[PDB]
Design a protein around this ligand. Structure first.
Ligand SMILES: *[C@@H]1O[C@H](CO)[C@@H](O[C@@H]2O[C@H](CO)[C@@H](O)[C@H](O)[C@H]2NC(C)=O)[C@H](O)[C@H]1NC(C)=O
Ligand code: NAG
Ligand code: NAG
Ligand code: NAG
Ligand code: NAG
Lengths: 52, 106, 47
């Protein structure tokens, strides 16, 4: 798929068919937000004290 | 020996102090003021009125609480807000409890 | 003195003159950070 398609939120489901499965179909989903460990934005200000 | 200077219950500041003791010598002990603030991360401008949106600003004036709105709920006093409940054509004005297990009747 | 002048960090020396002093004067300097270095133990928990 194109990169711009991956940037937009798409399910892009993967379907696997097999006789040994109970329901015979396995579905998995993935997108840009799949995984993505939490990003921290610590923007701390400390020079306003100016030594009391 | 930790001494508690002040403690605002609904702000959850817990300003404390202790004098750490080193070996006996001319005074080099480190005086410390120890605070423990619990930010809610989900409370509103009124913790009682649900209509107000999420509050981003977190204001902590130490001198103001050492001597009004606050962020943390209390376990002792009750927070009751008036809420509408409707059955049919008419409506009845009823009370509610914002948080459970805090001040339930005994 | 005004507090704004204190916040500027002047010398603010107190010259004390006496006969018993070897140099007949003695002064000390106060400043905004004239005391302890004031190291901070600041911590931020995100549990
Ligand atoms: C958001 O906070 C304000 C703070 O003043 C509250 O308004 C009054 O709060 C007192 C406190 O119990 C009530 O007795 C009054 O009835 C409230 N005023 C009104 C008009 O309800 C209130 O918690 C919130 N503000 C509003 C407009 O609901
Ligand atoms: C991270 O913090 C910096 C500094 O405040 C800010 O400029 C930047 O936009 C932040 N990034 C985000 C919120 O994704
Ligand atoms: C600060 O450090 C001292 C150890 O010197 C500790 O006893 C105290 O509990 C600490 N303060 C807080 C708020 O944990
Ligand atoms: C901050 O500085 C003090 C001064 O030495 C030190 O004892 C303390 O452990 C430091 N904090 C951390 C997280 O290292
Ligand atoms: C604060 O400083 C003391 C040094 O006396 C250190 O033992 C302690 O771990 C520090 N507190 C921290 C790192 O939270």
């Amino acid at each position: 798929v194109s990169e711009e398609e991956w940037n937009t939120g798409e399910t892009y489901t993967c379907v696997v068919a097999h006789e040994a499965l109970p329901n015979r179909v396995t579905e998995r989903t993935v997108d840009k937000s799949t995984g993505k460990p939490t990003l921290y934005n610590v923007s701390l200000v400390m020079s306003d004290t100016a030594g009391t | 020996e930790r001494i508690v200077l002040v403690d605002n219950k609904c702000k959850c500041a817990r300003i404390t102090s202790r004098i750490i003791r080193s070996s006996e010598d001319p005074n080099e002990d480190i005086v410390e003021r120890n605070i423990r603030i619990i930010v809610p991360l989900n409370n509103r401008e009124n913790i009682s009125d649900p209509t107000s949106p999420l509050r981003t600003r977190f204001v902590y004036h130490l001198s103001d609480l050492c001597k009004e709105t606050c962020y943390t709920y209390d376990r002792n006093k009750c927070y009751t807000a008036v809420v509408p409940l409707v059955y049919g054509g008419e409506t009845k004005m009823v009370e509610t409890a914002l948080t459970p297990d805090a001040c339930y009747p005994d």
